[PDB]
Symmetry: C3
Subunit: 306 residues, 3 copies
């Protein structure tokens, strides 16, 4: 079992400084030793340096850094594609969530029937025509879903992307801050999600059971787990740019990761939005990074029973 | 849909200074904007000034401020009755829980077939003959329930009350600190409650389903939600006078409020016992007020899925 | 109902200073008054003074303080045995968990059909041949189970010990940090456990139901509850030597204790591993002790509904 680790210090999908230091923070929290201990053979690609784009002006006076985000993702997709082609399960450390455009695109090149489990407080499914922030980290799913493409304009730097997956191939877990146009999109395209309210009702065991029935109930598929640290309650993961009260507990997050491992199908994992500079103390930053490491290790087989 | 907001700075139902500043704290936490955003047409009645009573001596060398609490409640009931009669769902900000004598009396004055959901760590059902504290905020339910009246003596300032509400028409959620005579009362009059232990067993979904089956399972009735902030765990709502460990989680509180909204029958709401002065820090005070706003907004339709 | 309280300031089953002050901390937190209030008739044995053993050198160059732990446990066993035969339910305050060798041995002397509910983040079932720490507090169960005796070497000071429990007569609740050879032992000997993951799946109600079906489903038996404070999440019980993230909530711990009380069969209880010196503040120490008192009081009938 081989795992590739790619640092992707994306910050230009959003406006808050510091998220580019997430990969270093997660490595410093002992990621590689934890993975080695489980028996993973590792290839560390280090932290990538992405090519900047000069004069990357706003698109439509709103969308920030489109060419930079587009090119960084094109470059990242090439690395992810190569790693998956070489037989590695691919762990990408962020960095802001716009990097999922690149990781999912790269992953889908060799694994076109992948499915996506998107664990997040947010749906990240605004389009360039619905976003009220202009921040691409709150739009990445819109660029990836085939059914949405007539509603998504062509951004500069984005021409290389071709939507990778169907709306029936993504399931959200943890949602508790969704913009009204995103709610419209989720309902209109029948995209399945388990919000925090659904977890309150069903419990995390049934949520995972139903997630897998929707995605792999009738056929095996490589799983892409895109995990935004802000899915966790801010008491547990304070070092992040968009915290929302009332999130996953520690135990719920471990359970999600355990079930992902138990499928035997995990093929790529993103761990995004750790921003150590937003912690009010070193302890806050380190606990957030420690939590990120626990998620990744659990996703690759660390158990709570020995 | 129209909502009236009434500030009721009651503090004489108990002995701790500061709870009279609860209404201002909740307002400063953004209550009105949150309600407007949901589509509520608002009538703000401001913070009421209640008429004092001279020489309001203890009743029976025990019960504190009886005439002051009686008259403040009589005055409050007049405002609540007018608001409800004019078509508003009536939100009353406390202030200590003795104010529910006035809000429920005033609500019932217009809506005699109302039912009550009482969310609290405490049953608040001592009578003047069973209370060990003498504090009227731990007695309001005894003045309101028809079946209990042959056991409730007449307090000065209390003669105006017309307690018609049946013991079958109140359900408690959250109970974890109940005095022995209150336990006797709950059992003897077959009053239904879901204690924290019941929530541990059933889960909040089934608790809400069972609550509504009891109250509105046979017929539609206006709902009065009387919500003591101390229902929440003290880690979440520290700025309150009688905290008890082991309370509702944030998610459970939001779920209760969401289910109240989903009935379409919410007619009045009390949010009581926020005391900003009992916070150890500005942060503790503000988080308690923010939580109060979240409960109110969720009760009028704020969702966690957009 | 009569309850003996025994202080057992064991520290030599592990290496961290301070756990010998656990019994005093629990008493200072109001244990005796809480038990009296429930109607318990009390015999306080005080804190026992155990006979030291000079030159208690490492066994096999690894196992720490074997003669001291063995002798202290032999002495403790005599006290517990006498107390149980005099008709007391026996509460032993720790002290490190190696004391359970003594309490369970003493208990079983007059109650051979006892069963054991072991509430803990850890399985405490290493043998002298599997331990990697050498600390006897992580081994007590191996000395007590009949089925394991061909794999447990004779330690100096341990000759008085006869295993008196079958592997089918112990159930674990709370497990989340289990060493690989302990996992092998649990599986190989079909020892039943409900890990944190099992609690996440089933809920604490179902966990207790299944626990009692396994132990007393066919006949009434005296129950020995051995409760390591580290079963609780470290946010709730920080003052302990081996904290592990993702533990029982306050409510889950109360529910466990309530269900133990509800059986009517509680015969002895250990409350171990409170180490006030490991608190980083007096508040942390006090909350851990207060929690210990809550567990013991709930196990003897304190309710959350009055
Ligand atoms: N929907 C947001 C989401 C930002 C978080 C992105 B993720 O999950 O990668 O971290 C936020 C929109 N905003 C919410 C608050 C009110 C105004 C709109 C957006 O910017 O589009
Ligand atoms: N039962 C109490 C309740 C006080 C809280 C009122 B609420 O819910 O509005 O905030 C307290 C009685 N007291 C409990 C602790 C032990 C002594 C008696 C009382 O004073 O009657
Ligand atoms: N399994 C441990 C358990 C110690 C806790 C004892 B109890 O529950 O009474 O508090 C720990 C072994 N250690 C765990 C971390 C990795 C190395 C081995 C041991 O020392 O045997
Ligand atoms: Mn997010
Ligand atoms: Mn995201
Ligand atoms: Mn209360
Ligand atoms: Mn109350
Ligand atoms: Mn332990
Ligand atoms: Mn232990």
């Amino acid at each position: 079992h081989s795992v590739a680790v790619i640092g992707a210090p994306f910050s230009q999908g959003q406006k808050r400084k510091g998220v580019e230091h997430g990969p270093a923070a997660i490595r410093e929290a002992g990621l590689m030793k934890r993975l080695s201990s489980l028996g993973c053979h590792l290839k560390d690609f280090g932290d990538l340096s992405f090519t900047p784009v000069p004069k990357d002006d706003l698109y439509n006076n709103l969308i920030v850094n489109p060419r930079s985000v587009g090119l960084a993702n094109q470059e990242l997709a090439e690395v992810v594609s190569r790693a998956v082609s070489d037989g590695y399960s691919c762990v990408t450390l962020g960095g802001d969530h716009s990097l999922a455009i690149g990781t999912i695109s790269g992953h889908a090149r060799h694994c076109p029937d992948l499915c996506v489990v998107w664990v997040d407080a947010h749906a990240d499914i605004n389009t360039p025509l619905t976003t009220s922030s202009g921040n691409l980290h709150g739009q990445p799913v819109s660029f990836l879903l085939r059914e949405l493409q007539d509603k998504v304009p062509q951004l500069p730097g984005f021409s290389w992307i071709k939507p990778c997956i169907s709306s029936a191939s993504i399931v959200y877990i943890g949602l508790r801050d969704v913009d009204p146009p995103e709610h419209f999109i989720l309902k209109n395209y029948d995209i399945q999600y388990f919000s925090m309210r659904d977890i309150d009702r069903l419990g995390i065991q049934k949520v995972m059971e139903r997630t897998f029935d929707l995605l792999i109930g009738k056929r095996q598929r490589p799983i892409h787990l895109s995990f935004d640290i802000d899915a966790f309650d801010p008491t547990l993961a304070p070092a992040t740019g968009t915290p929302v009260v009332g999130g996953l507990t520690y135990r719920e997050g471990m359970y999600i990761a355990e079930e992902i491992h138990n499928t035997g199908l995990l093929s790529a994992l993103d761990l995004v939005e750790v921003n150590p500079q937003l912690a009010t103390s070193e302890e806050e930053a380190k606990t957030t990074a420690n939590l990120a490491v626990d998620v990744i290790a659990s996703s690759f087989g660390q158990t709570r029973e020995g």
